[PDB]
Scaffold this active site. Structure first.
Site, PDB file in Angstrom:
ATOM      1  N   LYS B  13       0.804  -1.212   0.000  1.00 42.13           N
ATOM      2  CA  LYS B  13       0.000   0.000   0.000  1.00 42.13           C
ATOM      3  C   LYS B  13       0.842   1.269   0.000  1.00 42.13           C
ATOM      4  CE  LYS B  13      -3.551  -2.666   0.174  1.00 42.13           C
ATOM      5  NZ  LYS B  13      -4.359  -2.870  -1.061  1.00 42.13           N
ATOM      6  N   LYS B  73       0.880   4.910  -5.127  1.00 41.30           N
ATOM      7  CA  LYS B  73       1.532   3.643  -5.442  1.00 41.30           C
ATOM      8  C   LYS B  73       2.157   3.692  -6.831  1.00 41.30           C
ATOM      9  CE  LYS B  73      -2.286   1.905  -2.837  1.00 41.30           C
ATOM     10  NZ  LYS B  73      -3.674   1.378  -2.979  1.00 41.30           N
ATOM     11  N   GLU B 164      -6.981  -2.350  -9.881  1.00 39.28           N
ATOM     12  CA  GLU B 164      -8.106  -2.235 -10.797  1.00 39.28           C
ATOM     13  C   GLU B 164      -8.786  -0.877 -10.719  1.00 39.28           C
ATOM     14  OE1 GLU B 164      -9.709  -6.757 -11.630  1.00 39.28           O
ATOM     15  OE2 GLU B 164     -10.876  -5.483 -10.278  1.00 39.28           O
TER      16      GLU B 164
HETATM   17  C1  LIG Z   1      -2.942  -1.599   5.322  1.00 35.26           C
HETATM   18  C2  LIG Z   1      -3.180  -0.396   6.233  1.00 35.26           C
HETATM   19  C3  LIG Z   1      -2.634   0.849   5.967  1.00 35.26           C
HETATM   20  C4  LIG Z   1      -3.039   1.688   6.989  1.00 35.26           C
HETATM   21  C5  LIG Z   1      -2.652   3.160   7.075  1.00 35.26           C
HETATM   22  N1  LIG Z   1      -3.813   0.986   7.847  1.00 35.26           N
HETATM   23  C6  LIG Z   1      -3.927  -0.265   7.449  1.00 35.26           C
HETATM   24  C7  LIG Z   1      -4.733  -1.194   8.250  1.00 35.26           C
HETATM   25  C8  LIG Z   1      -5.940  -1.905   7.552  1.00 35.26           C
HETATM   26  C9  LIG Z   1      -7.100  -2.298   8.224  1.00 35.26           C
HETATM   27  C10 LIG Z   1      -8.115  -2.930   7.491  1.00 35.26           C
HETATM   28  N2  LIG Z   1      -8.006  -3.160   6.187  1.00 35.26           N
HETATM   29  C11 LIG Z   1      -9.092  -3.817   5.464  1.00 35.26           C
HETATM   30  C12 LIG Z   1      -8.764  -4.197   4.015  1.00 35.26           C
HETATM   31  C13 LIG Z   1      -8.111  -5.390   3.718  1.00 35.26           C
HETATM   32  C14 LIG Z   1      -7.845  -5.713   2.397  1.00 35.26           C
HETATM   33  C15 LIG Z   1      -8.244  -4.853   1.386  1.00 35.26           C
HETATM   34  N3  LIG Z   1      -7.974  -5.181   0.005  1.00 35.26           N
HETATM   35  O1  LIG Z   1      -6.647  -5.298  -0.432  1.00 35.26           O
HETATM   36  O2  LIG Z   1      -8.867  -5.348  -0.739  1.00 35.26           O
HETATM   37  C16 LIG Z   1      -8.905  -3.673   1.681  1.00 35.26           C
HETATM   38  C17 LIG Z   1      -9.170  -3.348   3.000  1.00 35.26           C
HETATM   39  C18 LIG Z   1      -6.927  -2.796   5.526  1.00 35.26           C
HETATM   40  C19 LIG Z   1      -5.887  -2.166   6.187  1.00 35.26           C
HETATM   41  C20 LIG Z   1      -4.843  -0.892   9.680  1.00 35.26           C
HETATM   42  C21 LIG Z   1      -5.070  -1.714  10.827  1.00 35.26           C
HETATM   43  C22 LIG Z   1      -5.261  -3.215  10.894  1.00 35.26           C
HETATM   44  C23 LIG Z   1      -5.079  -0.861  11.926  1.00 35.26           C
HETATM   45  C24 LIG Z   1      -4.866   0.414  11.447  1.00 35.26           C
HETATM   46  C25 LIG Z   1      -4.804   1.660  12.337  1.00 35.26           C
HETATM   47  N4  LIG Z   1      -4.734   0.356  10.098  1.00 35.26           N
HETATM   48  B1  LIG Z   1      -4.474   1.458   9.112  1.00 35.26           B
HETATM   49  F1  LIG Z   1      -3.366   2.455   9.861  1.00 35.26           F
HETATM   50  F2  LIG Z   1      -5.917   2.198   8.732  1.00 35.26           F
HETATM   51  C1  LIG Z   2      -7.068  -8.082 -10.073  1.00 37.67           C
HETATM   52  C2  LIG Z   2      -6.776  -7.379  -8.782  1.00 37.67           C
HETATM   53  C3  LIG Z   2      -7.094  -6.034  -8.634  1.00 37.67           C
HETATM   54  C4  LIG Z   2      -6.821  -5.380  -7.437  1.00 37.67           C
HETATM   55  N1  LIG Z   2      -7.140  -4.046  -7.301  1.00 37.67           N
HETATM   56  C5  LIG Z   2      -6.872  -3.390  -6.117  1.00 37.67           C
HETATM   57  C6  LIG Z   2      -7.190  -2.046  -5.979  1.00 37.67           C
HETATM   58  O1  LIG Z   2      -7.711  -1.441  -6.914  1.00 37.67           O
HETATM   59  N2  LIG Z   2      -6.924  -1.394  -4.793  1.00 37.67           N
HETATM   60  C7  LIG Z   2      -6.339  -2.077  -3.744  1.00 37.67           C
HETATM   61  O2  LIG Z   2      -6.102  -1.492  -2.689  1.00 37.67           O
HETATM   62  N3  LIG Z   2      -6.021  -3.413  -3.877  1.00 37.67           N
HETATM   63  C8  LIG Z   2      -6.283  -4.072  -5.061  1.00 37.67           C
HETATM   64  N4  LIG Z   2      -5.974  -5.408  -5.190  1.00 37.67           N
HETATM   65  C9  LIG Z   2      -5.332  -6.111  -4.030  1.00 37.67           C
HETATM   66  C10 LIG Z   2      -6.331  -7.007  -3.303  1.00 37.67           C
HETATM   67  O3  LIG Z   2      -7.129  -6.227  -2.447  1.00 37.67           O
HETATM   68  C11 LIG Z   2      -5.574  -8.049  -2.496  1.00 37.67           C
HETATM   69  O4  LIG Z   2      -4.915  -8.914  -3.394  1.00 37.67           O
HETATM   70  C12 LIG Z   2      -6.471  -8.881  -1.593  1.00 37.67           C
HETATM   71  O5  LIG Z   2      -7.051  -8.053  -0.612  1.00 37.67           O
HETATM   72  C13 LIG Z   2      -5.589  -9.925  -0.927  1.00 37.67           C
HETATM   73  O6  LIG Z   2      -4.477  -9.247  -0.385  1.00 37.67           O
HETATM   74  P1  LIG Z   2      -2.960  -9.704  -0.674  1.00 37.67           P
HETATM   75  O7  LIG Z   2      -2.561  -9.198  -2.040  1.00 37.67           O
HETATM   76  O8  LIG Z   2      -2.067  -9.053   0.354  1.00 37.67           O
HETATM   77  O9  LIG Z   2      -2.830 -11.207  -0.631  1.00 37.67           O
HETATM   78  C14 LIG Z   2      -6.233  -6.069  -6.382  1.00 37.67           C
HETATM   79  C15 LIG Z   2      -5.917  -7.414  -6.537  1.00 37.67           C
HETATM   80  C16 LIG Z   2      -6.189  -8.070  -7.730  1.00 37.67           C
HETATM   81  C17 LIG Z   2      -5.844  -9.521  -7.876  1.00 37.67           C
END
Ligand SMILES: CC1=CC(C)=[N+]2C1=C(c1cc[n+](Cc3ccc([N+](=O)[O-])cc3)cc1)c1c(C)cc(C)n1[B-]2(F)F
Ligand SMILES: Cc1cc2nc3c(=O)[nH]c(=O)nc-3n(C[C@H](O)[C@H](O)[C@H](O)COP(=O)(O)O)c2cc1C
Ligand SMILES: Cc1cc2nc3c(=O)[nH]c(=O)nc-3n(C[C@H](O)[C@H](O)[C@H](O)COP(=O)(O)O)c2cc1C
EC number: 1.-.-.-
Lengths: 216, 216
Positions: B13, B73, B164
């Protein structure tokens, strides 16, 4: 490490029936399928792994018609994976995704759980209500897993081949994927190649980077 | 260990802009994009790897609307690849692929080439006339290439993220695509993670195999 693995992995056209997977690699084959990334952690897939000569036979019925050349790969190989994707994305299944995240320790306070639920429900509504390509949206997540898989087993020292040349309709009926709500996409056997595999011997061909790649 | 690759890879991220990829990693970026498998070896893709700040800037225009949270990113990462797919499958791309295979020495006699060439036009014609999924086929292969790429960069010791949430139309106008005969699908930056990336800290979350997998 990975560069030369990618440069010698090949689609094996003939398998050795006797070379069976280690009891543990039969569990890491399981591991690569689950811990693959997916759009917003959707994971819109389901896997049928056939390790028996009862299961491998039922899949190879798919390789009929103009797909006859792909049936020995279905039978001769030791472990056959069938990649399937959801037909449609229900609200309760995306509820299951976040709850599983909740149990695995990704959220500190509750606010984040709700946020992700709708960070997911933004993209979901984007595809399942406006674009109406949710089936295809979910399918492409699984081809990514396929790619993740084919490099995985290669580096693990296993032979494999991806196959699309199969009659999805029968494979759907054979294991009732229409009734569960899924559709077969790709069938990947994994095992060990026979020297009857003329592809292990032939040099890889790709198109040159000047055609395929642009640097800016 | 490749299984540990799947269990330690994460969606980055936040990237550190200073830590740039070495020219050898910068020549390894290309090979994983080139030497990935393909259905009938069509390879219906094109890659734009943006390596300097102005090239990275043109790509990041995609994430300017309601996708701003993913824009840094694309900015801080060293090498940014945007995966593209062909709009439609021409006859000559089928011509150049097999001709390229011939140049690499895959066919002993000329008859084997013609057999290979139309076995390709069997799948091709099926998708362009019978199935109507001309584009969606040219899209799913590159999602597979993505999957091969995402494990390659992890095992290469590199940080990466799939994206995406970007405006495909903007990036396509930005580099004048589709007139080219190509389409942005996914944007993959890769580089090195910053101290602001809290995704490296969280435990991996998946759905349990009892839900997604069936052994037969
Ligand atoms: C990665 C991250 C960066 C920052 C600045 N924080 C975090 C996390 C966090 C929490 C929940 N989720 C849900 C989630 C998971 C997967 C996908 N996905 O990839 O689709 C989208 C959303 C994502 C990240 C976090 C936690 C656990 C506690 C705090 C204070 N933070 B945070 F400082 F807000
Ligand atoms: C096709 C594809 C598109 C994705 N697009 C986004 C996105 O737009 N934004 C984002 O934060 N993560 C994106 N992701 C990351 C996914 O959220 C992530 O792969 C999923 O939460 C599992 O986390 P991991 O990659 O750490 O295993 C994408 C992943 C895939 C495979
Ligand atoms: C989605 C997909 C489907 C494939 N289906 C078949 C198939 O039905 N029959 C076959 O012989 N090979 C199939 N292949 C293998 C390709 O022909 C092969 O990957 C390509 O010619 C490049 O060879 P390589 O795997 O050694 O890199 C498939 C590959 C992919 C990615």
């Amino acid at each position: 490490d990975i560069i030369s693995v990618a440069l010698k992995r090949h689609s094996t056209k003939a398998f050795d029936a006797s070379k069976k997977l280690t009891p543990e690699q039969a569990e890491q084959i399981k591991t690569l399928l689950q811990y693959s990334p997916s759009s917003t952690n959707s994971q819109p897939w389901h896997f049928i792994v056939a390790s028996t000569e009862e299961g491998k036979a039922r899949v190879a019925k798919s390789a009929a018609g103009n797909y006859v050349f792909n049936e020995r790969k279905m039978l001769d190989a030791s472990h056959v994976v069938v990649f399937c994707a959801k037909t449609a994305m229900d609200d309760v299944w995306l509820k299951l995704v976040v709850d599983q995240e909740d149990a695995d320790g990704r959220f500190a306070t509750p606010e984040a759980k709700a946020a992700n639920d709708k960070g997911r429900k933004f993209f979901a509504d984007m595809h399942r209500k406006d674009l109406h390509d949710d089936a295809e949206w979910m399918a492409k997540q699984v081809y990514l897993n396929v790619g993740n898989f084919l490099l995985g087993v290669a580096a693990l020292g296993l032979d494999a081949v991806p196959i699309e040349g199969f009659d999805a309709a029968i494979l759907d009926a054979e294991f009732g994927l229409k009734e569960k709500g899924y559709t077969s996409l790709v069938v990947v056997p994994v095992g060990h190649h026979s020297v009857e595999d003329f592809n292990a011997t032939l040099p890889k061909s790709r198109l040159p980077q000047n055609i395929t790649l642009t640097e800016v």
